[PDB]
Symmetry: C2
Subunit: 474 residues, 2 copies
Amino acid sequence: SGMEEWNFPVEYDENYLPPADSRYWFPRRETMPAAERDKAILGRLQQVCQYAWEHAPFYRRKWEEAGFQPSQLKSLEDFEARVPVVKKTDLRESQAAHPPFGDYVCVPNSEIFHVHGTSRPTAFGIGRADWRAIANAHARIMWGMGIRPGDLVCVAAVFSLYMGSWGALAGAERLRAKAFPFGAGAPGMSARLVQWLDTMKPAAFYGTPSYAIHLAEVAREEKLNPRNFGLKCLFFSGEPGASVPGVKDRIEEAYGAKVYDCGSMAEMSPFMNVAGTEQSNDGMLCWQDIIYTEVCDPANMRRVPYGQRGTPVYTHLERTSQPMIRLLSGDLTLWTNDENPCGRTYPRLPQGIFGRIDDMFTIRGENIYPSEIDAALNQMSGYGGEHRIVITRESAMDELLLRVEPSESVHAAGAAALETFRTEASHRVQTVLGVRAKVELVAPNSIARTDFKARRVIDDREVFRALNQQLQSS
Amino acid sequence: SGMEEWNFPVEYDENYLPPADSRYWFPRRETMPAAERDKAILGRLQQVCQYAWEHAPFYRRKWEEAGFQPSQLKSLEDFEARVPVVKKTDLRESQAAHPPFGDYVCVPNSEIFHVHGTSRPTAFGIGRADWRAIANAHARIMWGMGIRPGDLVCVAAVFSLYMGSWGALAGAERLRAKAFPFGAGAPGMSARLVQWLDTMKPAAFYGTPSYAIHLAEVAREEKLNPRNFGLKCLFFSGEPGASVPGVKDRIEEAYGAKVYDCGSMAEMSPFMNVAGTEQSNDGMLCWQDIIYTEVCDPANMRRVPYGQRGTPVYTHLERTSQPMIRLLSGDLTLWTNDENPCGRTYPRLPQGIFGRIDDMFTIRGENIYPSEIDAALNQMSGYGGEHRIVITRESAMDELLLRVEPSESVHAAGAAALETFRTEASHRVQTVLGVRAKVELVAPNSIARTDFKARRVIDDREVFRALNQQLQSS
Ligand SMILES: C[C@H](O)CC(=O)OP(=O)(O)OC[C@H]1O[C@@H](n2cnc3c(N)ncnc32)[C@H](O)[C@@H]1O
Ligand SMILES: C[C@H](O)CC(=O)OP(=O)(O)OC[C@H]1O[C@@H](n2cnc3c(N)ncnc32)[C@H](O)[C@@H]1O
């Protein structure tokens, strides 16, 4: 194959740095013919499954139950059809019966390097070798975004249980960038951060797309201009936004920089296994030789053809601790296999990830993702930057209830101008989704902003009824 | 000398682990005759000063101004008398004139690994080699606290600009412990942490002494018992507490574990250069071959005899990036040179560090440190766990104004019992300090707790006058 440092268990040269003129960290692995890579992926898949059968009674029990033995993995078609998907509920049960890390940990207790998790929570017990595998994978993909040694990288996501921040930091460290782990979560942090970004002038920023928006309002409230932060790029994970039309454009305009989309799941660190590149800057590429991504039909867990929508199912190819083999994301995406501007021979998620299938709600037989509402509103000049979707999953909904913020300039323009925006927001959303949308305007900057993931859906039956009844009276 | 890995610039074997039966990480460096170590320290001091003269125009300019050349460093007595102390104000000025890291950075820009700082803030630009020097120094000292490979270490301090959390994490990583960087700072964290500590059962905890107290109230509010967290120890830095009589005893009782004191300054990472050991568990030892600590008379910056109080002045012996040479802490301590129970041949701070000299206030010609008030109150069964000291530095104070919380059981006992506590708190404080103390009781759990450093002094002239006038009327 000629694939750079292709071995299981993986063991990367910590001193390797690509030549300054190279677009790719690993030219072979990244640009080789896709059919050549798929051969080696299957080869690795066999190694991983044999490794899990040997060290994980979770996989040994699960596979035996579905009638699977690693010797039956003889093609990628055998993998999708014979190998049962892992659910997050299966991990929880394994952790409850085999505490703290479950019967899929594989490595001895003495190998565990870092303890992280979800916020029943699942604990991540990551071995020393996996932490190195994650740092190398992430430095590689960050290089793909045009981030370089010596660049100041601001990691502005909470450093706690959450894998996002640690993963971007490990990549920055391995990339030989100046890692700036400012973090997030504490009151007073954002006001101080904007001063640090104005002083330090970083080449790159990491966090959630929501935080980047909130930080520009803080920069402006703090009489600082966020275009003067010297940013060449901002790269995000954690939620949709970075591949959302009006959201991506708002962030790139506010900072005068490029926006990159990345991120699968925390269970799937190196989570940057799905990430956009400097040239293929829309959506994300599936870095197949790091983690094998399958976009599947949720009805049978088999790959959907390219150009079709489905759910990402992921498999670690370079992890010995808590390896995930065919973990069901529960997310919705579309994947294609056409030529990429960067020249990387990987499948792509051209519109990134739409959201979690469970987050979707139905109004008059029409399926709606919260990200579709966020996209339509952000493409409006009069929109204030925040909204809430008020629903009920207990009874059928005839209309969409929205609490939308107008801009301070729309507010300053008077009652008639506010009313003109409320009606135009309602119409736009109706034209986009094909559903009746009731809009209630709230005061500018009244809706809570976040430095983490935006939770815009209020699924309470009493809140829904109170709002509908109030909107019927007005 | 036979000192393990004694070299400048330092370059530690990342695979070294002491034998399981050893009390010391480095038997020679830690237990050698003090006069033998002081010879090699002076030798290193010469190397460091030559290194700074060559790479830092900040030190070249400062030393030339004080009439000092590194060739004049011919004894430890030459060091204290000839070498001018560095002030935090000098670092700020150097950073403003030579942004971002100042003219004392020494290493090239390309060597900077991590960016941290203070919260005018000073930026820390720490090189890759220094980060390794810090991780090794900290693993060594944590081993001294009886912390071992495979032990689950909860790092519960904010992961941001602040060096404390990163320093404990780097030590845990190098110690081959299971590093658990939960962090601090965000609302909802403490309630979730107590659940993680009950589930995970860590051998060690890191944070501020204030946070450990707050976390026990959260554990109890959450109907969990903090003695059931499996803790063998809690080790703290950031503020006094861990060497404060009633505070140390309250924490050890609440958790059923040992408490260790550590920590100099963030500018002085590896900040654990002052730290207690499993056997010398009261106060802190000065790990002289890591950082050279001098307890000086603030009037002349010369060492005070053992058994006398003074200000810690620190010098890095194993740092190439932003090396600190005779940095004035502005803190107050007492140092002695008697035999230590662990058998380490180091000077000791038997009562740790009392506080920042600037934090001290005067009432009727009597000098008081906020930690003396904290100590007296914490040694009272009826004390609720929080208080505020209300002062004025604008006019002379005749009496001490205190806002003290009683316990919920003292409150439930009625008005007479609350009044009996208010008078007894006043008397105790008067007997301790020798000053009139006016006590106002506040509602139990009304005073804000913290996961960081406790700021108990309110130095406002209007607040002081309002309180005195209110206390004169009652
Ligand atoms: C540790 C990383 O930050 C990823 C992460 O947030 O892990 P979590 O377990 O906390 O959450 C994963 C879920 O967030 C979403 N999710 C994560 N990244 C997404 C993206 N780029 N686009 C659309 N949705 C995305 C997506 O629904 C994914 O399944
Ligand atoms: C990065 C480390 O946590 C140390 C730290 O907090 O660095 P900072 O620069 O943020 O603050 C240093 C000051 O906190 C105090 N300070 C720090 N540790 C102390 C202790 N153990 N006992 C008494 N006072 C102590 C002491 O006054 C010291 O000068």
